[PDB]
């Protein structure tokens, strides 16, 4: 199809571009604002302290960014409960990078753990996407009797039930969690949504991360992903 | 098969656990590392500069945190970075190397992902068929030499399956690792770790890196799409 694929590439490349121009246009001015603050603060500090040299201070900063990135603070990060969660981020290919592997050992093990883990997960999700497939099929099935009876043709019910497969799953797996997190971690609704979608598309910037509330999330992920596996493929056709 | 899938879940859950115990055992000893560095560095700077006062410097730091949180770097949203960022979204790698501060941007980021990913998913599926039929017709030439040297045509399908990988591997893993190790001055171990993390679309963003790289990604992913599925069967 080798002409059609070059046609796609060009579309993708124009898409990436058209994206980057929108992201830039939205972000750059606020980044720039932020950077004006810093740049000004740095300079004042140098002027205010003549015994300090620029090439001295410049190093100090490099430390702080590295240390703050490493997770120092001007509640253990590798307890069991966080470690599990981390382990989870790997197989799910979400990879927040919320925490980082310092040791080489860990990096090395991380490799083998991924190669095995991911497909093992990919299988399980394919299995859940069949059972969640046959779950929602049998779910609407009793109420399908009432739909057909109220003056609806058999071509039209397949679009209404397709919408409700989504709007119900959506309600459970998107709308509901957004409140939950917005409440729990005291984010905005916008943020909750943004987090929710970023998480489920398995992008996982890790810009955002999170007694009944602790385990509930691990579950929610698995079923949500199954749900969204289908939502993506439907768009693949739509395209 | 609904009994078999519950059996898998339990395996996954034991796997996650067995993982977390390994990660913990390796990492937990270096939790407080990061804070020791800072605390020590702060104090040296004070000792090294007597004209600086604690309560002066303490402010300056508070700025840094706020500015870094705001997204400055002691241009991050030029065109060339933005493209790359845009790329990280559709590929579902999502380093989070840079982050969307504005709400506008977050909002747009949503719609951009929903469209972009499947558009990419199509392209990768297309490349994984043509790169599929490319390597098949490539190693198809060397299949003639395998058959002649006391090998049946049932066994050549395993030898060429190995060489599909070992050649692709060479190009798409071994080669890049040197490249980056050299270029960005990482260790070979790190290069590998980065390479694999990138290609599995995990993208911690612990490690990140001129146009030749953008290409390499696309073909490598196609390659690794197949490498995962082969392990799925293998298991």
């Amino acid at each position, epitope marked *: 199809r080798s002409t059609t694929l070059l046609a796609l590439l060009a579309l993708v490349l124009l898409y990436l571009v058209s994206g980057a121009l929108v992201f830039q246009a939205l972000e750059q001015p606020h980044e720039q604002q932020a950077q004006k603050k810093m740049d000004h603060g740095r300079d004042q500090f140098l002027r205010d302290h003549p015994c300090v040299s620029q090439k001295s201070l410049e190093d100090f900063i*490099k430390l702080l960014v590295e240390a703050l990135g490493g997770g120092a603070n001007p509640s253990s990060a590798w307890n069991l409960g966080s470690a599990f969660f981390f382990s989870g981020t790997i197989i799910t290919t979400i990879g927040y990078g919320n925490i980082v592997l310092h040791t080489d050992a860990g990096r090395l093990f991380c490799i083998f753990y991924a190669l095995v883990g991911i497909p093992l997960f990919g299988m399980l999700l394919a299995g859940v996407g069949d059972r969640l497939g046959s779950s929602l099929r049998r779910g609407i099935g009793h109420i399908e009797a009432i739909f057909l009876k109220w003056h609806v043709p058999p071509g039209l019910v397949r679009s209404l039930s397709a919408v409700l497969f989504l709007l119900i799953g959506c309600l459970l797996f998107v709308l509901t969690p957004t409140f939950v997190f917005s409440y729990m971690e005291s984010w905005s609704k916008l943020e909750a949504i943004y987090f929710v979608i970023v998480t489920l598309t398995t992008v996982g910037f890790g810009d955002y991360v999170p007694p009944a509330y602790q385990p509930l999330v691990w579950f929610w992920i698995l079923f949500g992903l199954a749900y969204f596996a289908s939502v993506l493929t439907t768009i693949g056709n739509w395209l | 098969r609904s009994t078999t899938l519950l059996a898998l879940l339990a395996l996954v859950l034991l796997y996650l656990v067995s993982g977390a115990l390994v990660f913990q055992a390796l990492e937990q000893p270096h939790e*407080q590392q990061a804070q*020791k560095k800072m605390d020590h560095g702060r104090d*040296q700077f004070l000792r090294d*500069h007597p004209c600086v006062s604690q309560k002066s410097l303490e402010d300056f730091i508070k700025l840094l945190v706020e500015a870094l949180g705001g997204g400055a770097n002691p241009s991050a949203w030029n065109l060339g970075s933005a493209f790359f960022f845009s790329g990280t979204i559709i590929t579902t790698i999502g380093y989070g190397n840079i982050v969307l501060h504005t709400d506008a941007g977050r909002l747009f980021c949503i719609f951009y992902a929903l469209v972009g990913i499947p558009l990419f998913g199509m392209l990768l599926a297309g490349v994984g068929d043509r790169l599929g039929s490319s390597l098949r017709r490539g190693i198809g030439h060397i299949e003639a030499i395998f058959l002649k040297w006391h090998v049946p045509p049932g066994l050549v399908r395993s030898l060429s399956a190995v060489l599909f990988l070992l050649i692709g591997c060479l190009l798409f893993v071994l080669t890049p690792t040197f490249v980056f190790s050299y270029m960005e001055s990482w260790s070979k171990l790190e290069a590998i770790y980065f390479v694999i993390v990138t290609l599995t679309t995990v993208g911690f963003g612990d490690y990140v890196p001129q146009p030749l790289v953008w290409f390499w990604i696309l073909f490598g992913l196609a390659y690794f799409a197949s490498v995962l599925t082969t392990i799925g069967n293998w298991l």
Partner: antibody, heavy 123, light 107 residues
Framework: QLQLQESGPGLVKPSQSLSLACSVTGFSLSTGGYQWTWIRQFPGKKLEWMGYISYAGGITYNPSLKSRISITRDTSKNQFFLQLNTVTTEDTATHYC???????????????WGQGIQVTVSS | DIQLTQLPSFLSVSPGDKVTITCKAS??????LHWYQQKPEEAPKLLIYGASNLQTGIPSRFSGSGYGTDFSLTINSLDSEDVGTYFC????????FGPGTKLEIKR
């Protein structure tokens, strides 16, 4: 090129003050990013870092050896100076003058060293 | 005071050979460890800074690694010139050194 060369008395009498001096050529005391240090090597070749002074003139000391040491400097001559009070036969060692650099702020590594001066503590 | 134990104490090796020394730290040092070679009647030379980074103007046959407590310095291809006592020193105050590790070259 950068050169460091130690100076002072080869012999010191117990319960006196040892005082040495280091002369830097090809480089400035007061240049930002490099600090300066005194290190000693005992008979038996075991090294103890004593003290350490900034380009800016800030001081850090081995607490084991505090309350006897004072390091000073003279920016004009381009030198710096070690003192150590109430010397004993313990403090007999080969004193070394060295420049300090960082591998991220704080991480002190001594890149360029001095000739070495042998100081003895005897009656 | 952070204590640096360095093993082995002594060893001798033939030229061309590869060699590896250990420094073990009493606390977690977070990759802030440096390696020096002292020849007789001389002050130390800096080989390796920041655990793994090779000092400029020192041949590639030297290479160090480690993180945290346990580090190691490796010489790939001993020349006759590699004789001396080797030390490790840590970055945090007070800065402490290793006890020394003497390398004889067999012939």
């Amino acid at each position: 090129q950068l050169q460091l060369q130690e100076s002072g008395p080869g012999l010191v009498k117990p319960s006196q003050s040892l005082s040495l001096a280091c002369s830097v050529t090809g480089f400035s005391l007061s240049t930002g990013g490099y600090q300066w240090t005194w290190i000693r090597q005992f008979p038996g070749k075991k090294l103890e870092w004593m003290g350490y002074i900034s380009y800016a003139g800030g001081i850090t000391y081995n607490p084991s050896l505090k309350s006897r040491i004072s390091i000073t400097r003279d920016t004009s001559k381009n030198q710096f100076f070690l003192q150590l009070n109430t010397v004993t036969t313990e403090d007999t060692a080969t004193h070394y003058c060295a420049r300090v650099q960082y591998s991220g702020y704080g991480n002190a590594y001594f890149d360029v060293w001095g000739q070495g001066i042998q100081v003895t503590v005897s009656s | 005071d952070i204590q640096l134990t360095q093993l082995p104490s002594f060893l001798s090796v033939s030229p061309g050979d590869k060699v590896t020394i250990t420094c073990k730290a009493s606390q977690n040092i977070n990759q802030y460890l440096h390696w020096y070679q002292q020849k007789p009647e001389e002050a130390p030379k800096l080989l390796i800074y920041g655990a793994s980074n090779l000092q400029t103007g020192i041949p590639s046959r030297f290479s160090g690694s480690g993180y945290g407590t346990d580090f190691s310095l490796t010489i790939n291809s001993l020349d006759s010139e590699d004789v001396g006592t080797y030390f490790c020193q840590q970055g945090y105050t007070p800065r402490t050194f290793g006890p020394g590790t003497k390398l004889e070259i067999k012939r």
